[PDB]
Amino acid sequence: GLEKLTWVSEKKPDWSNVQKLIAACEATNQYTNIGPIISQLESFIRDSFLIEESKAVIVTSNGTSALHALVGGINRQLGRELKFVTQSFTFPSSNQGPLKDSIIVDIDEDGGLDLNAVKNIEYDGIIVTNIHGNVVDINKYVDFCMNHNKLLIFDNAATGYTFYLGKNSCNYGHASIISFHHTAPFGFGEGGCIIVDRLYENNIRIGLNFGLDNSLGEKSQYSNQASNYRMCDLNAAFILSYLQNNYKKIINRHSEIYEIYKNNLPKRFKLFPNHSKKNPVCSSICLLFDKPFRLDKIPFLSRKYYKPLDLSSPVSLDFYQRILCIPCNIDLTDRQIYEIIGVLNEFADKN
Amino acid sequence: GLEKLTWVSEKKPDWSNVQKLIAACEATNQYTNIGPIISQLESFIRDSFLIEESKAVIVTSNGTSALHALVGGINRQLGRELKFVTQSFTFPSSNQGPLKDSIIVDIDEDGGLDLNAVKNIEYDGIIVTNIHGNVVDINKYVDFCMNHNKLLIFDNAATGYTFYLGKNSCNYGHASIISFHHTAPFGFGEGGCIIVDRLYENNIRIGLNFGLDNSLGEKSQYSNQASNYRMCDLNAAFILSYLQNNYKKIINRHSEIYEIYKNNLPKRFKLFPNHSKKNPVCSSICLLFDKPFRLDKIPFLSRKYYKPLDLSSPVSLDFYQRILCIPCNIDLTDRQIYEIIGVLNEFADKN
Ligand SMILES: Cc1ncc(COP(=O)(O)O)c(/C=N/[C@H]2[C@H](O)[C@@H](O)[C@@H](OP(=O)(O)OP(=O)(O)OC[C@H]3O[C@@H](n4cc(C)c(=O)[nH]c4=O)C[C@@H]3O)O[C@@H]2C)c1O
Ligand SMILES: Cc1ncc(COP(=O)(O)O)c(/C=N/[C@H]2[C@H](O)[C@@H](O)[C@@H](OP(=O)(O)OP(=O)(O)OC[C@H]3O[C@@H](n4cc(C)c(=O)[nH]c4=O)C[C@@H]3O)O[C@@H]2C)c1O
Ligand SMILES: [Cl-]
Ligand SMILES: [Cl-]
Ligand SMILES: [Cl-]
Ligand SMILES: [Cl-]
Ligand code: NA
Ligand code: NA
Numbered sequence: 201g202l203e204k205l206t207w208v209s210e211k212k213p214d215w216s217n218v219q220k221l222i223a224a225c226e227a228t229n230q231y232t233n234i235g236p237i238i239s240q241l242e243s244f245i246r247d248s249f250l251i252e253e254s255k256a257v258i259v260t261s262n263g264t265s266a267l268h269a270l271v272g273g274i275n276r277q278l279g280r281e282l283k284f285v286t287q288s289f290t291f292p293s294s295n296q297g298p299l300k301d302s303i304i305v306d307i308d309e310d311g312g313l314d315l316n317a318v319k320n321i322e323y324d325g326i327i328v329t330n331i332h333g334n335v336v337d338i339n340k341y342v343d344f345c346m347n348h349n350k351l352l353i354f355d356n357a358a359t360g361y362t363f364y365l366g367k368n369s370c371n372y373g374h375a376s377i378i379s380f381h382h383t384a385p386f387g388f389g390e391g392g393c394i395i396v397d398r399l400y401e402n403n404i405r406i407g408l409n410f411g412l413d414n415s416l417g418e419k420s421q422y423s424n425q426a427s428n429y430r431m432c433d434l435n436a437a438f439i440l441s442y443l444q445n446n447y448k449k450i451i452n453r454h455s456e457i458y459e460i461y462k463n464n465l466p467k468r469f470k471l472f473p474n475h476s477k478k479n480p481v482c483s484s485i486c487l488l489f490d491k492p493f494r495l496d497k498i499p500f501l502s503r504k505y506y507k508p509l510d511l512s513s514p515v516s517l518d519f520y521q522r523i524l525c526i527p528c529n530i531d532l533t534d535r536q537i538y539e540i541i542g543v544l545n546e547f548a549d550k551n
Numbered sequence: 552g553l554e555k556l557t558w559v560s561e562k563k564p565d566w567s568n569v570q571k572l573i574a575a576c577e578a579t580n581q582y583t584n585i586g587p588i589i590s591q592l593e594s595f596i597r598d599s600f601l602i603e604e605s606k607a608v609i610v611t612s613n614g615t616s617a618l619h620a621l622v623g624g625i626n627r628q629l630g631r632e633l634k635f636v637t638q639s640f641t642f643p644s645s646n647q648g649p650l651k652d653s654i655i656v657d658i659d660e661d662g663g664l665d666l667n668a669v670k671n672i673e674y675d676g677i678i679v680t681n682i683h684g685n686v687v688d689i690n691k692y693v694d695f696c697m698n699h700n701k702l703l704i705f706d707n708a709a710t711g712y713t714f715y716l717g718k719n720s721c722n723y724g725h726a727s728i729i730s731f732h733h734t735a736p737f738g739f740g741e742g743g744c745i746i747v748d749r750l751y752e753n754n755i756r757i758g759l760n761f762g763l764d765n766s767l768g769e770k771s772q773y774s775n776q777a778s779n780y781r782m783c784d785l786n787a788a789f790i791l792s793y794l795q796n797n798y799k800k801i802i803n804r805h806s807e808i809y810e811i812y813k814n815n816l817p818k819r820f821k822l823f824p825n826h827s828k829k830n831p832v833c834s835s836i837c838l839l840f841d842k843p844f845r846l847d848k849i850p851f852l853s854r855k856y857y858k859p860l861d862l863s864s865p866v867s868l869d870f871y872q873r874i875l876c877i878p879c880n881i882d883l884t885d886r887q888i889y890e891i892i893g894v895l896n897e898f899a900d901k902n
Binding site: 206208210211212213215219222226229230231232233261262263264265268291292293295296297300301381382388389390410411412420422424425426427428430432433434435438507509 | 557559561562563564566570573577580581582583584612613614615616619642643644646647648651652732733734739740741761762763769771773774775776777778779781783784785786789858860
């Protein structure tokens with residue numbers, strides 16, 4: 201039964217839909233450098249994920265490039281290489297590229313960057329990871345960055361449709377990023393998106409194109425803070441088509457999977473910390489066992505995220521050692537979920 | 552007849568062929584993190600472009616990420632952020648990402664980084680741009696870097712199939728990069744490739760995946776010098792298909808178009824400096840006028856590359872003021888070439 205578990209739902213192109221979209225590229229020979237699909241996908245993300253008009257929606261090559269293009273654009277606007285703090289319990293993206301020298305501090309027990317740990321640090325902003333669709337106490341972080349006059353970026357790579365006080369979590373802070381990597385619920389191949397205050401929109405958009413702005417003609421000027429961060433229209437067509445066919449079913453079905461775990465917790469596990477009133481839409485079901493344990497004890501497909509970036513982050517290491525990330529996708533039957541919960545109950549009695 | 556000039560030939564997916572290649576992805580749900588297409592495109596590039604076995608062929612998301620992945624891999628291998636010199640007369644890529652603090656020096660009149668400008672300064676390596684399919688005197692750079700114990704990278708973004716003393720220019724220096732951007736002769740959408748000494752292959756390839764090596768399980772370690780730099784298998788399929796169908800015709804027709812300009816040079820125009828014995832395979836036909844002039848004087852689709860990264864570099868600036876980059880692609884007719892040449896004679900008579 202559980203032998204057939206996969207991390208990601210089986211994802212195949214709607215070839216007729218993808219070919220219809222790319223027929224726009226074929227007619228003009230424009231397949232990149234902001235061809236005719238980019239605005240269709242940015243529009244679809246705004247209207248489907250419910251991004252406020254105060255935010256630009258900016259697609260990039262991947263979730264990593266979304267975060268990097270966001271920072272390089274803000275670096276260009278403020279005129280220096282900004283110093284960000286990130287949490288140890290997250291993916292490498294937030295200590296790479298323009299963040300390669302980001303400061304790493306521990307999480308608190310709610311899964312986000314420990315605000316008590318930056319007391320005595322020099323920094324311009326913080327990056328907080330909303331883990332696998334779960335969200336932190338977002339207003340704790342908004343209030344803190346308002347009071348201390350800091351930039352706030354939410355790493356929502358795995359968190360495209362978790363609502364906080366009646367609005368997509370992507371709408372909070374100065375910006376968020378989401379991943380359309382194949383392993384993400386909304387993903388297909390590679391891609392990313394920046395949700396950012398309009399203040400920074402132009403510098404981030406031209407920052408996808410080496411900092412060059414064709415609208416300036418001979419005044420067009422590259423920035424050493426920019427790169428090739430743009431989304432290819434080919435990738436936009438595959439992502440847009442996947443979202444068109446699947447995004448509603450993913451939200452409802454992922455919410456249904458979360459409901460079953462919430463009402464049938466195996467003994468001595470807890471749900472990863474989450475601060476949304478409705479079920480989050482998760483990239484995996486993350487449970488914390490009450491004691492450290494090794495994945496090879498679990499006789500079904502399962503993972504640990506995230507290996508701490510700084511292995512001297514004690515709260516981050518504890519979570520890593522105690523966490524069990526279970527597949528969450530639209531291919532999973534309830535029968536499989538109940539068979540999973542029974543294997544975990546067994547494990548809990550013998551460990 | 553010059554109304555219908557395009558920079559790039561009309562490029563259209565061979566959909567039955569692309570569908571056939573991506574069927575391997577559909578069968579396993581693996582569309583990135585090195586799916587079943589990556590090895591196929593890497594092999595084709597090795598066998599078709601005639602790369603030697605002492606070189607890795609490593610595809611990436613774009614030409615920029617090929618350069619940045621190359622530098623990040625080497626930085627991580629040597630345990631230090633290496634200092635590169637780049638030429639002013641190049642694209643912004645070689646002053647971005649891990650090269651954002653690269654030293655910019657002038658070209659000499661042969662079109663490459665002026666070695667006299669790095670006699671008395673600190674640096675680990677040089678990046679030399681082979682402009683639009685033209686190649687520098689490659690052995691003077693190989694000899695200099697061997698004598699001074701310096702790394703040598705060729706920015707071959709626009710230069711996939713120009714031969715130097717019997718082998719693809721990509722096989723010289725410690726590494727080269729090529730672009731599969733839609734604007735490149737070999738390109739389709741977005742893509743890049745690294746041709747590099749085997750010594751650096753493993754650090755560069757894991758460096759496309761945040762520095763992570765799955766084969767090491769728990770000792771898998773991210774690097775602050777890495778990123779998401781991989782090519783998605785979707786992109787690999789479009790590029791591999793375009794190359795299967797067109798690469799031979801592009802090589803022959805681009806060489807024939809060059810032959811016509813070389814035997815019918817317009818008045819007071821010289822070919823861009825080139826050191827290949829056979830006609831180079833050009834991304835555009837670059838001519839130097841005998842004095843500065845404006846593009847708005849040329850009554851057909853034409854460009855100037857490259858706006859100097861450092862506007863104070865005198866040879867780079869002189870080149871930019873005198874250069875005319877004429878479309879070179881497999882849609883161009885001989886009729887159109889002789890018309891362009893007639894227009895440039897008329898331009899010379901009046902300027
Ligand atoms: C908080 C955060 N911020 C930023 C980012 C950066 O976003 P991107 O630049 O990646 O868009 C991430 C990435 N988060 C993602 C990564 O994107 C992904 O590589 C995977 O990191 P790995 O676990 O190292 O990948 P891999 O082991 O290859 O795949 C996991 C499972 O998915 C399966 N899979 C994978 C791919 C690529 C596929 O095409 N099909 C498929 O079935 C295989 C396996 O069972 O998951 C992370 C959580 C992130 O979690
Ligand atoms: C020396 C060197 N190193 C590194 C790189 C970096 O490689 P990538 O990361 O780009 O793969 C480049 C790129 N060199 C290329 C760039 O790839 C391209 O953006 C274009 O830089 P722009 O001139 O700023 O782009 P754009 O004006 O949009 O395109 C030029 C012409 O191509 C036409 N076009 C363009 C696209 C994107 C398309 O899809 N279809 C099409 O017909 C329109 C126009 O007439 O040309 C450069 C020489 C380079 O020349
Ligand atoms: Cl809420
Ligand atoms: Cl679909
Ligand atoms: Cl084709
Ligand atoms: Cl030769
Ligand atoms: Na927008
Ligand atoms: Na706001």
